């Protein structure tokens, strides 16, 4: 059942890193928008740790 979701970006809040990452729709309707965000949360494998280069678009 289709839940019309949006893919957004979300910023890693951690100071050393600070990368844009695009979430899955399913990972976009998680996100707590009263925590903070880090990439680690990312369950996208690819694009899922601050050592990881920014996607481009
Ligand atoms: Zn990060």
Same mark, same amino acid.
């Given at each position: ?15 050393? +890193? ?21 990439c ?8 899922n740790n +601050?050592s990881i ?5």
């Amino acid at each position: 059942e289709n839940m019309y979701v949006n893919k957004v970006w979300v910023q890693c809040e951690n100071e050393n +890193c600070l990368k844009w990452r695009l979430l899955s729709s399913e990972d976009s309707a998680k996100v707590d928008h009263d925590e903070p965000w880090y990439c680690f949360m990312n369950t996208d494998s690819r694009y899922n740790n +601050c050592s990881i280069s920014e996607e481009d678009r």
